[PDB]
Amino acid sequence: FKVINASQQQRFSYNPHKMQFIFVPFLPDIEDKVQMFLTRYYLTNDRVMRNENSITPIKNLLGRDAQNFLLLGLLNKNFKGNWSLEDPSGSVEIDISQTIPTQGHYYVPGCMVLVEGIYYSVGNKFHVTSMTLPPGERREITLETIGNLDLLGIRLDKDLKIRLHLLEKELTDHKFVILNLFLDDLKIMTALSKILQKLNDDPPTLLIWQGSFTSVPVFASMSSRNISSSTQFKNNFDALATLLSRFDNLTENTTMIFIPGPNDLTLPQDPIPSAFTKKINKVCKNVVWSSNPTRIAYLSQEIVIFRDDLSGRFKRHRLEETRKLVKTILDQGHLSPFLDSLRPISWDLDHTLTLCPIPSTMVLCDTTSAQFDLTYNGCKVINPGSFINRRARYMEYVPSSKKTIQEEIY
């Protein structure tokens, strides 16, 4: 039972002939960039093969001139209306002129989909019957076909220990606390005062401090107050550490986790530096600084935490709600199904963002949708929503019974 370090995690590469991963383990390489999407295509390929209306490459159809296939590819774009599609065997412009597809989750670019139709080589523009997304299977059969290795950290698989589930179903002593959170307002101080008031009595176990610790970003340019974004943020930490030290009931038996948001000093992202967490590391002894995103090494489960604006980007890019969002992220099996010219993902840690296999719980702290918790093929996906303008609301999750309770003060 630990917290997985993204900068210190392993790496696994897939082989289609052996259908398995190899012992892979500063700046990345070119091969990483190429094999990034290559690994994506072959992973989706094998994922399709696990589900056994046929299979055909682009070169097979372009070699002909007549027809009739459900092609696989990325909804990319070269020119206006020149929505091209690419597999590792050729490129082809596709059109959806007067198409009545299904009611998919959220069709977005940079996504590998399946479209049926005919070529019509006179203009060589493939037509679409219906656009569909690659289906995602349950975690049971998924973990059945992964093989016999370790994908979370313990190397083979030995999860046949009923004592794990029994002790978790009995030791209710380990509770998770989830609260956007700024630091330079009296309202924040008040909220934290009543929150810790609820926390000094009942000892929690794992604190999850969300991102966006400041209303403003970095890149300071005015030395009016003889300060900068760094110094201001440092003093904000000092104030938080002082309120934290006002009540020493905490850190006695509760572990904490910081998570950097989008406005602190491009994915993935290393945590808040030690130079700004010096005093809190001195006062406390149960601190950690995980990258965004990260995974909690839970003894029998795969919980992943990722804070970003998911709903705020899908609506600004569809061609022509909450379950649509969750359905999209789980079916594509990836956290950022977006082009690299849109969200620059670091070449080294693309595997970290990969949802191979299906995780147990994805903590998606959205900053533009309400708080919820729903199920979709088993993985209970949550959202705590905002924290201040929603009249001070927060969440508490039970891992054993998987209970989800909301707690509001106003």
Numbering used by the authors: 170 to 194, 207 to 233, 266 to 367, 378 to 402, 405 to 490, 502 to 556, 598 to 665, 667 to 688
List passages from the publication reporting this PDB structure:
Hetero-tetrameric Pol epsilon plays a key role in replisome maturation and origin activation. Pol2 is the catalytic subunit, with the N-terminal half containing DNA synthesis/exonuclease functions. The C-terminal half of Pol2 (C-Pol2) has been predicted to contain a second polymerase fold, which has become inactivated during evolution, and is followed by a zinc-finger appendix. Notably, the catalytic domain of Pol epsilon is dispensable for viability (though cells are sick), while the non-catalytic C-Pol2 is essential.
To understand the role of the essential Pol epsilon modules during DNA replication, we studied the structure of a truncation mutant of the yeast tetrameric complex, lacking the dispensable, flexibly tethered N-terminal catalytic domain of Pol2 (hereafter, deltacat). To mitigate this problem, we incubated our preparation with 0.01% of crosslinking agent glutaraldehyde for one minute on ice, before cryo-grid making. We determined a 3D structure of the deltacat core based on 161,372 particles, to an average resolution of 4.45 Å (4.3 Å in the core and 5 Å in the periphery), revealing a compact assembly of dimensions 100 × 90 × 60 Å. To interpret the map, we have docked a recently published structure of human C-terminal Dpb2 bound to the Pol2 C-terminal zinc-finger appendix, providing an unambiguous fit. Docking of a Pol1-based homology model of C-Pol2 into the cryo-EM density required splitting the polymerase into three domains, which were used in independent rigid-body fitting and subsequent real-space refinement. The resulting structure shows a polymerase fold with jaws spread wide open. In agreement with the notion that certain elements are only flexibly tethered to the deltacat core, no density was retrieved for the N-terminal domain of Dpb2, nor for the histone-like subunits Dpb3-Dpb4. For example, the C-terminus of Dpb2 intimately contacts C-Pol2, explaining why a truncation of the last six amino acids in Dpb2 prevents Dpb2 binding to Pol2-Dpb3-Dpb4 and results in a lethal phenotype. Likewise, a so-called ZnF1 element in the Pol2 zinc-finger appendix emerges as the organizing center of the deltacat core, explaining why cysteine-to-alanine single amino acid changes in this region can alter the essential non-catalytic Pol epsilon core, hence abolishing cellular growth. Furthermore, inspecting a more complete Pol2 structure that extends beyond the conserved polymerase module revealed that the C-terminal zinc-finger appendix occludes the DNA-binding groove in the dead polymerase fold.
